[PDB]
PDB file of all heavy atoms in Angstrom:
ATOM      1  N   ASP B 138     -14.577 -70.822 -30.561  1.00  0.00           N
ATOM      2  CA  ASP B 138     -14.513 -71.371 -29.185  1.00  0.00           C
ATOM      3  C   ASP B 138     -13.808 -70.338 -28.195  1.00  0.00           C
ATOM      4  O   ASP B 138     -13.202 -70.773 -27.279  1.00  0.00           O
ATOM      5  CB  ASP B 138     -13.943 -72.697 -29.128  1.00  0.00           C
ATOM      6  CG  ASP B 138     -14.255 -73.490 -27.881  1.00  0.00           C
ATOM      7  OD1 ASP B 138     -15.436 -74.040 -27.879  1.00  0.00           O
ATOM      8  OD2 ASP B 138     -13.522 -73.577 -26.961  1.00  0.00           O
ATOM      9  N   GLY B 139     -14.043 -68.994 -28.479  1.00  0.00           N
ATOM     10  CA  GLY B 139     -13.339 -68.079 -27.713  1.00  0.00           C
ATOM     11  C   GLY B 139     -11.859 -68.077 -27.828  1.00  0.00           C
ATOM     12  O   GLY B 139     -11.118 -67.987 -26.878  1.00  0.00           O
ATOM     13  N   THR B 140     -11.250 -68.166 -29.095  1.00  0.00           N
ATOM     14  CA  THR B 140      -9.919 -68.111 -29.300  1.00  0.00           C
ATOM     15  C   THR B 140      -9.554 -66.646 -29.548  1.00  0.00           C
ATOM     16  O   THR B 140     -10.027 -66.062 -30.604  1.00  0.00           O
ATOM     17  CB  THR B 140      -9.493 -68.917 -30.545  1.00  0.00           C
ATOM     18  N   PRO B 141      -8.677 -66.057 -28.671  1.00  0.00           N
ATOM     19  CA  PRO B 141      -8.550 -64.548 -28.804  1.00  0.00           C
ATOM     20  C   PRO B 141      -7.648 -64.315 -29.863  1.00  0.00           C
ATOM     21  O   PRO B 141      -6.525 -64.822 -30.032  1.00  0.00           O
ATOM     22  CB  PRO B 141      -7.945 -64.218 -27.392  1.00  0.00           C
ATOM     23  CG  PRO B 141      -7.343 -65.535 -26.931  1.00  0.00           C
ATOM     24  CD  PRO B 141      -8.122 -66.597 -27.398  1.00  0.00           C
ATOM     25  N   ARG B 142      -8.061 -63.354 -30.737  1.00  0.00           N
ATOM     26  CA  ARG B 142      -7.283 -62.970 -31.893  1.00  0.00           C
ATOM     27  C   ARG B 142      -7.255 -61.401 -32.018  1.00  0.00           C
ATOM     28  O   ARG B 142      -8.265 -60.777 -31.762  1.00  0.00           O
ATOM     29  CB  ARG B 142      -7.825 -63.551 -33.252  1.00  0.00           C
ATOM     30  CG  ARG B 142      -7.713 -64.995 -33.280  1.00  0.00           C
ATOM     31  CD  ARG B 142      -8.264 -65.623 -34.587  1.00  0.00           C
ATOM     32  NE  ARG B 142      -8.219 -66.999 -34.619  1.00  0.00           N
ATOM     33  CZ  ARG B 142      -9.164 -67.773 -34.113  1.00  0.00           C
ATOM     34  NH1 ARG B 142     -10.197 -67.275 -33.662  1.00  0.00           N
ATOM     35  NH2 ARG B 142      -9.072 -69.073 -34.163  1.00  0.00           N
ATOM     36  N   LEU B 143      -6.126 -60.824 -32.467  1.00  0.00           N
ATOM     37  CA  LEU B 143      -6.138 -59.455 -32.628  1.00  0.00           C
ATOM     38  C   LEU B 143      -5.061 -59.284 -33.960  1.00  0.00           C
ATOM     39  O   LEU B 143      -3.979 -59.845 -33.960  1.00  0.00           O
ATOM     40  CB  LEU B 143      -5.655 -58.594 -31.501  1.00  0.00           C
ATOM     41  CG  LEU B 143      -4.165 -58.526 -30.919  1.00  0.00           C
ATOM     42  CD1 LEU B 143      -4.059 -57.329 -30.064  1.00  0.00           C
ATOM     43  CD2 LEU B 143      -3.798 -59.767 -30.299  1.00  0.00           C
ATOM     44  N   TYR B 144      -5.579 -58.619 -34.974  1.00  0.00           N
ATOM     45  CA  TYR B 144      -4.739 -58.418 -36.147  1.00  0.00           C
ATOM     46  C   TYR B 144      -4.613 -56.935 -36.263  1.00  0.00           C
ATOM     47  O   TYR B 144      -5.448 -56.103 -35.774  1.00  0.00           O
ATOM     48  CB  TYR B 144      -5.334 -58.868 -37.414  1.00  0.00           C
ATOM     49  CG  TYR B 144      -5.655 -60.384 -37.558  1.00  0.00           C
ATOM     50  CD1 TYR B 144      -6.347 -60.936 -38.534  1.00  0.00           C
ATOM     51  CD2 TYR B 144      -5.190 -61.346 -36.666  1.00  0.00           C
ATOM     52  CE1 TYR B 144      -6.536 -62.291 -38.754  1.00  0.00           C
ATOM     53  CE2 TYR B 144      -5.461 -62.684 -36.658  1.00  0.00           C
ATOM     54  CZ  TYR B 144      -6.148 -63.140 -37.748  1.00  0.00           C
ATOM     55  OH  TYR B 144      -6.468 -64.467 -37.914  1.00  0.00           O
ATOM     56  N   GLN B 145      -3.565 -56.500 -36.898  1.00  0.00           N
ATOM     57  CA  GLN B 145      -3.357 -55.110 -37.261  1.00  0.00           C
ATOM     58  C   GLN B 145      -3.447 -54.865 -38.739  1.00  0.00           C
ATOM     59  O   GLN B 145      -3.241 -55.786 -39.397  1.00  0.00           O
ATOM     60  CB  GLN B 145      -2.138 -54.439 -36.611  1.00  0.00           C
ATOM     61  CG  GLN B 145      -0.860 -55.121 -37.228  1.00  0.00           C
ATOM     62  CD  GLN B 145       0.342 -54.549 -36.537  1.00  0.00           C
ATOM     63  OE1 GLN B 145       0.206 -53.689 -35.672  1.00  0.00           O
ATOM     64  NE2 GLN B 145       1.507 -55.135 -36.983  1.00  0.00           N
ATOM     65  N   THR B 146      -3.604 -53.646 -39.180  1.00  0.00           N
ATOM     66  CA  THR B 146      -3.584 -53.273 -40.566  1.00  0.00           C
ATOM     67  C   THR B 146      -2.454 -52.363 -40.869  1.00  0.00           C
ATOM     68  O   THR B 146      -1.572 -52.127 -40.025  1.00  0.00           O
ATOM     69  CB  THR B 146      -4.911 -52.718 -41.051  1.00  0.00           C
ATOM     70  OG1 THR B 146      -5.096 -51.456 -40.311  1.00  0.00           O
ATOM     71  CG2 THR B 146      -5.905 -53.625 -40.997  1.00  0.00           C
ATOM     72  N   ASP B 147      -2.356 -51.865 -42.146  1.00  0.00           N
ATOM     73  CA  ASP B 147      -1.285 -51.042 -42.680  1.00  0.00           C
ATOM     74  C   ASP B 147      -1.822 -50.186 -43.738  1.00  0.00           C
ATOM     75  O   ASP B 147      -2.846 -50.683 -44.353  1.00  0.00           O
ATOM     76  CB  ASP B 147      -0.178 -52.007 -43.152  1.00  0.00           C
ATOM     77  CG  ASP B 147       1.167 -51.227 -43.432  1.00  0.00           C
ATOM     78  OD1 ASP B 147       1.972 -50.951 -42.396  1.00  0.00           O
ATOM     79  OD2 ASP B 147       1.372 -50.903 -44.614  1.00  0.00           O
ATOM     80  N   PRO B 148      -1.273 -49.055 -43.939  1.00  0.00           N
ATOM     81  CA  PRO B 148      -1.713 -48.223 -45.102  1.00  0.00           C
ATOM     82  C   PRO B 148      -1.379 -48.954 -46.351  1.00  0.00           C
ATOM     83  O   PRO B 148      -2.229 -48.690 -47.450  1.00  0.00           O
ATOM     84  CB  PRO B 148      -0.872 -46.942 -45.019  1.00  0.00           C
ATOM     85  CG  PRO B 148      -0.693 -46.836 -43.509  1.00  0.00           C
ATOM     86  CD  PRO B 148      -0.499 -48.182 -43.012  1.00  0.00           C
ATOM     87  N   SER B 149      -0.498 -49.795 -46.560  1.00  0.00           N
ATOM     88  CA  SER B 149      -0.354 -50.705 -47.847  1.00  0.00           C
ATOM     89  C   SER B 149      -1.513 -51.736 -47.814  1.00  0.00           C
ATOM     90  O   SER B 149      -1.877 -52.048 -48.870  1.00  0.00           O
ATOM     91  CB  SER B 149       0.975 -51.358 -47.813  1.00  0.00           C
ATOM     92  OG  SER B 149       1.124 -52.339 -46.735  1.00  0.00           O
ATOM     93  N   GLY B 150      -1.963 -52.119 -46.612  1.00  0.00           N
ATOM     94  CA  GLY B 150      -3.055 -53.070 -46.595  1.00  0.00           C
ATOM     95  C   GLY B 150      -2.668 -54.505 -46.291  1.00  0.00           C
ATOM     96  O   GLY B 150      -2.935 -55.460 -46.965  1.00  0.00           O
ATOM     97  N   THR B 151      -1.769 -54.622 -45.292  1.00  0.00           N
ATOM     98  CA  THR B 151      -1.214 -55.932 -44.905  1.00  0.00           C
ATOM     99  C   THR B 151      -1.698 -56.232 -43.409  1.00  0.00           C
ATOM    100  O   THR B 151      -1.339 -55.667 -42.555  1.00  0.00           O
ATOM    101  CB  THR B 151       0.312 -55.992 -44.953  1.00  0.00           C
ATOM    102  OG1 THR B 151       0.890 -55.016 -44.114  1.00  0.00           O
ATOM    103  CG2 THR B 151       0.687 -55.666 -46.467  1.00  0.00           C
ATOM    104  N   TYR B 152      -2.699 -57.308 -43.378  1.00  0.00           N
ATOM    105  CA  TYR B 152      -2.988 -57.755 -42.057  1.00  0.00           C
ATOM    106  C   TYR B 152      -1.906 -58.579 -41.584  1.00  0.00           C
ATOM    107  O   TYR B 152      -1.309 -59.386 -42.276  1.00  0.00           O
ATOM    108  CB  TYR B 152      -4.332 -58.538 -42.218  1.00  0.00           C
ATOM    109  CG  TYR B 152      -4.266 -59.673 -43.096  1.00  0.00           C
ATOM    110  CD1 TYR B 152      -3.988 -60.889 -42.599  1.00  0.00           C
ATOM    111  CD2 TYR B 152      -4.657 -59.515 -44.516  1.00  0.00           C
ATOM    112  CE1 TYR B 152      -3.953 -61.994 -43.526  1.00  0.00           C
ATOM    113  CE2 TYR B 152      -4.646 -60.611 -45.297  1.00  0.00           C
ATOM    114  CZ  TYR B 152      -4.354 -61.882 -44.806  1.00  0.00           C
ATOM    115  OH  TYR B 152      -4.386 -63.010 -45.584  1.00  0.00           O
ATOM    116  N   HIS B 153      -1.713 -58.487 -40.163  1.00  0.00           N
ATOM    117  CA  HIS B 153      -0.408 -58.933 -39.559  1.00  0.00           C
ATOM    118  C   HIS B 153      -0.722 -59.333 -38.202  1.00  0.00           C
ATOM    119  O   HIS B 153      -0.745 -58.397 -37.301  1.00  0.00           O
ATOM    120  CB  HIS B 153       0.660 -57.994 -39.747  1.00  0.00           C
ATOM    121  CG  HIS B 153       2.042 -58.427 -39.373  1.00  0.00           C
ATOM    122  ND1 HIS B 153       2.733 -59.329 -40.142  1.00  0.00           N
ATOM    123  CD2 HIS B 153       2.725 -58.120 -38.285  1.00  0.00           C
ATOM    124  CE1 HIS B 153       3.827 -59.476 -39.487  1.00  0.00           C
ATOM    125  NE2 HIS B 153       3.932 -58.717 -38.387  1.00  0.00           N
ATOM    126  N   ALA B 154      -0.783 -60.589 -37.962  1.00  0.00           N
ATOM    127  CA  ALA B 154      -1.336 -61.096 -36.591  1.00  0.00           C
ATOM    128  C   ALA B 154      -0.320 -60.948 -35.532  1.00  0.00           C
ATOM    129  O   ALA B 154       0.797 -61.513 -35.727  1.00  0.00           O
ATOM    130  CB  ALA B 154      -1.817 -62.464 -36.787  1.00  0.00           C
ATOM    131  N   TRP B 155      -0.726 -60.391 -34.369  1.00  0.00           N
ATOM    132  CA  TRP B 155       0.149 -60.246 -33.282  1.00  0.00           C
ATOM    133  C   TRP B 155      -0.532 -60.867 -32.068  1.00  0.00           C
ATOM    134  O   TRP B 155      -1.723 -61.365 -32.069  1.00  0.00           O
ATOM    135  CB  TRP B 155       0.434 -58.802 -32.944  1.00  0.00           C
ATOM    136  CG  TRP B 155       1.495 -58.318 -33.735  1.00  0.00           C
ATOM    137  CD1 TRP B 155       2.332 -59.099 -34.449  1.00  0.00           C
ATOM    138  CD2 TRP B 155       2.057 -56.926 -33.830  1.00  0.00           C
ATOM    139  NE1 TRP B 155       3.342 -58.267 -35.099  1.00  0.00           N
ATOM    140  CE2 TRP B 155       3.240 -57.019 -34.682  1.00  0.00           C
ATOM    141  CE3 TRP B 155       1.806 -55.735 -33.316  1.00  0.00           C
ATOM    142  CZ2 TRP B 155       3.986 -55.924 -34.992  1.00  0.00           C
ATOM    143  CZ3 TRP B 155       2.500 -54.609 -33.600  1.00  0.00           C
ATOM    144  CH2 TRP B 155       3.634 -54.753 -34.371  1.00  0.00           C
ATOM    145  N   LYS B 156       0.160 -60.758 -30.895  1.00  0.00           N
ATOM    146  CA  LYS B 156      -0.221 -61.093 -29.608  1.00  0.00           C
ATOM    147  C   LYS B 156      -0.521 -59.909 -28.731  1.00  0.00           C
ATOM    148  O   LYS B 156      -1.408 -59.950 -27.862  1.00  0.00           O
ATOM    149  CB  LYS B 156       0.573 -62.147 -28.901  1.00  0.00           C
ATOM    150  N   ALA B 157       0.354 -58.891 -28.968  1.00  0.00           N
ATOM    151  CA  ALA B 157       0.086 -57.570 -28.341  1.00  0.00           C
ATOM    152  C   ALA B 157       0.435 -56.546 -29.375  1.00  0.00           C
ATOM    153  O   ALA B 157       1.051 -56.787 -30.372  1.00  0.00           O
ATOM    154  CB  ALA B 157       1.052 -57.427 -27.091  1.00  0.00           C
ATOM    155  N   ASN B 158       0.032 -55.268 -29.149  1.00  0.00           N
ATOM    156  CA  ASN B 158       0.131 -54.286 -30.160  1.00  0.00           C
ATOM    157  C   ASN B 158       0.270 -52.799 -29.467  1.00  0.00           C
ATOM    158  O   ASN B 158      -0.248 -52.664 -28.541  1.00  0.00           O
ATOM    159  CB  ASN B 158      -0.954 -54.371 -31.129  1.00  0.00           C
ATOM    160  CG  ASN B 158      -0.734 -53.427 -32.468  1.00  0.00           C
ATOM    161  OD1 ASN B 158       0.213 -52.823 -32.585  1.00  0.00           O
ATOM    162  ND2 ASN B 158      -1.694 -53.743 -33.329  1.00  0.00           N
ATOM    163  N   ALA B 159       0.985 -52.011 -30.255  1.00  0.00           N
ATOM    164  CA  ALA B 159       1.198 -50.602 -29.838  1.00  0.00           C
ATOM    165  C   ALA B 159       1.495 -49.721 -31.079  1.00  0.00           C
ATOM    166  O   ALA B 159       2.381 -50.103 -31.799  1.00  0.00           O
ATOM    167  CB  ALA B 159       2.329 -50.520 -28.812  1.00  0.00           C
ATOM    168  N   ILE B 160       0.642 -48.726 -31.277  1.00  0.00           N
ATOM    169  CA  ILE B 160       0.907 -47.813 -32.365  1.00  0.00           C
ATOM    170  C   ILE B 160       0.780 -46.416 -31.920  1.00  0.00           C
ATOM    171  O   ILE B 160       0.691 -46.136 -30.746  1.00  0.00           O
ATOM    172  CB  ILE B 160      -0.195 -48.150 -33.471  1.00  0.00           C
ATOM    173  CG1 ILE B 160      -1.453 -48.474 -32.795  1.00  0.00           C
ATOM    174  CG2 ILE B 160       0.387 -49.237 -34.461  1.00  0.00           C
ATOM    175  CD1 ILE B 160      -2.476 -47.301 -32.703  1.00  0.00           C
ATOM    176  N   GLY B 161       0.807 -45.471 -32.935  1.00  0.00           N
ATOM    177  CA  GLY B 161       0.750 -44.065 -32.518  1.00  0.00           C
ATOM    178  C   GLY B 161       2.207 -43.501 -32.280  1.00  0.00           C
ATOM    179  O   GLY B 161       3.174 -43.879 -32.857  1.00  0.00           O
ATOM    180  N   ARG B 162       2.265 -42.570 -31.440  1.00  0.00           N
ATOM    181  CA  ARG B 162       3.538 -41.858 -31.039  1.00  0.00           C
ATOM    182  C   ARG B 162       4.272 -42.675 -30.165  1.00  0.00           C
ATOM    183  O   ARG B 162       3.802 -43.259 -29.138  1.00  0.00           O
ATOM    184  CB  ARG B 162       3.174 -40.450 -30.409  1.00  0.00           C
ATOM    185  N   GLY B 163       5.512 -42.761 -30.492  1.00  0.00           N
ATOM    186  CA  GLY B 163       6.515 -43.592 -29.712  1.00  0.00           C
ATOM    187  C   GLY B 163       6.237 -45.034 -29.602  1.00  0.00           C
ATOM    188  O   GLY B 163       6.383 -45.572 -28.448  1.00  0.00           O
ATOM    189  N   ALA B 164       5.658 -45.649 -30.574  1.00  0.00           N
ATOM    190  CA  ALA B 164       5.193 -47.052 -30.556  1.00  0.00           C
ATOM    191  C   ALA B 164       6.332 -48.056 -30.311  1.00  0.00           C
ATOM    192  O   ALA B 164       6.011 -49.134 -29.761  1.00  0.00           O
ATOM    193  CB  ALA B 164       4.472 -47.392 -31.813  1.00  0.00           C
ATOM    194  N   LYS B 165       7.543 -47.682 -30.648  1.00  0.00           N
ATOM    195  CA  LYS B 165       8.688 -48.520 -30.424  1.00  0.00           C
ATOM    196  C   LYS B 165       8.957 -48.737 -28.968  1.00  0.00           C
ATOM    197  O   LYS B 165       9.160 -49.918 -28.401  1.00  0.00           O
ATOM    198  CB  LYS B 165       9.937 -47.978 -31.042  1.00  0.00           C
ATOM    199  N   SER B 166       8.947 -47.719 -28.209  1.00  0.00           N
ATOM    200  CA  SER B 166       9.094 -47.819 -26.733  1.00  0.00           C
ATOM    201  C   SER B 166       7.894 -48.397 -25.988  1.00  0.00           C
ATOM    202  O   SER B 166       8.153 -49.289 -25.086  1.00  0.00           O
ATOM    203  CB  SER B 166       9.266 -46.295 -26.109  1.00  0.00           C
ATOM    204  OG  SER B 166       8.122 -45.645 -26.172  1.00  0.00           O
ATOM    205  N   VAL B 167       6.805 -48.216 -26.462  1.00  0.00           N
ATOM    206  CA  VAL B 167       5.497 -48.792 -25.831  1.00  0.00           C
ATOM    207  C   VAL B 167       5.505 -50.276 -26.185  1.00  0.00           C
ATOM    208  O   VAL B 167       5.169 -51.076 -25.297  1.00  0.00           O
ATOM    209  CB  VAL B 167       4.307 -47.969 -26.361  1.00  0.00           C
ATOM    210  CG1 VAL B 167       3.056 -48.683 -25.721  1.00  0.00           C
ATOM    211  CG2 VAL B 167       4.469 -46.569 -26.037  1.00  0.00           C
TER     212      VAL B 167
END
Side-chain angles (χ1 to χ4, degrees), chain B residues 138-139 141-155 157-161 163-164 166-167:
Chain B
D138 202 75
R142 294 178 184 88
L143 74 165
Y144 300 172
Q145 64 183 357
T146 56
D147 191 81
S149 67
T151 59
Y152 60 94
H153 186 73
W155 275 355
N158 192 352
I160 37 91
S166 68
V167 181

